[PDB]
């Protein structure tokens, strides 16, 4: 054929891929974490947005730290050969490097490690997108007037 | 013949490292509200890093906190894009 370039990811496989949304609103009382009012508005906006981009969306609510790690493990063991990409959205409390389950924390590196190039082979070479709405510490930005 | 195992990841964080992230109890979080609006308007038009750049500008210019507590009042936010991608990403194709 004619001249061909390779500067963009191939996105015309038969499926766009999975979009997993983890929405943690209510936490166990012993943790002392407050309820995250407004997060169901976020989860519904994301489901409609990624539906229109032709992602297979799966929504999960109020998961424990054990449930988050078992979900991520099982999803990374599916066959993604006919999928172009992978998307995961996390909505919860957090600190630097950490996201909370309803009963305690999960390191973010533990979650993304299931999708590494050597451990999820049907996603090797394909874009893996993690979107994170959570605190990363306790500093506040005072801004500057323009 | 090999690629790094950490290649082809993108992390779209709602706030800068070390900072709180803001959420409105009626309207949703500043970052997700803004992300969904910019995907709706530009996913058929712009590459994904340029969409996330417009999300950074919307969060930084259009939101400011309101609180009866002086410590938490009149505060601002900037999201943080972390890319290990090796190619351009478009949500549409030919």
């Amino acid at each position: 054929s004619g001249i061909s370039l390779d500067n963009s990811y191939k996105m015309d496989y038969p499926e766009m891929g999975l979009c997993i949304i983890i929405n943690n609103k209510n936490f166990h009382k012993s943790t002392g974490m407050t309820s995250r009012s407004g997060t169901d508005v976020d989860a519904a906006n994301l489901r409609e947005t990624f539906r229109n981009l032709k992602y297979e969306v799966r929504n999960k609510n109020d998961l424990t730290r054990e449930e988050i790690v078992e979900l991520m493990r099982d999803v990374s063991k599916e066959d993604h050969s006919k999928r172009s990409s992978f998307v995961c959205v996390l909505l919860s409390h957090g600190e630097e490097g950490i996201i909370f389950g309803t009963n305690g924390p999960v390191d973010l590196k533990k979650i993304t490690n299931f999708f590494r190039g050597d451990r999820c082979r049907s996603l090797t070479g394909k874009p893996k997108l993690f979107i994170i709405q959570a605190c990363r510490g306790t500093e506040l930005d005072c801004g500057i007037e323009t | 013949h090999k690629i790094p195992v950490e290649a082809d990841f993108l992390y779209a964080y709602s706030t800068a490292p070390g900072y709180y992230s803001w959420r409105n109890s009626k309207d949703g979080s500043w970052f997700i509200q803004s992300l969904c609006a910019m995907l709706k308007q530009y996913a058929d038009k712009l590459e994904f890093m340029h969409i996330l750049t417009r999300v950074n500008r919307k969060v930084a210019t259009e939101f400011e906190s309101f609180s009866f507590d002086a410590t938490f009042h009149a505060k601002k936010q900037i999201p943080c894009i972390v890319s290990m991608l090796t190619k351009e990403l478009y949500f549409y194709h030919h």
Binding site: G38 | Y20, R23, S25, S65
Partner: peptide, 4 residues
């Protein structure tokens, strides 16, 4: 407005 609340923080995460």
């Amino acid at each position: 407005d609340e923080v995460x």
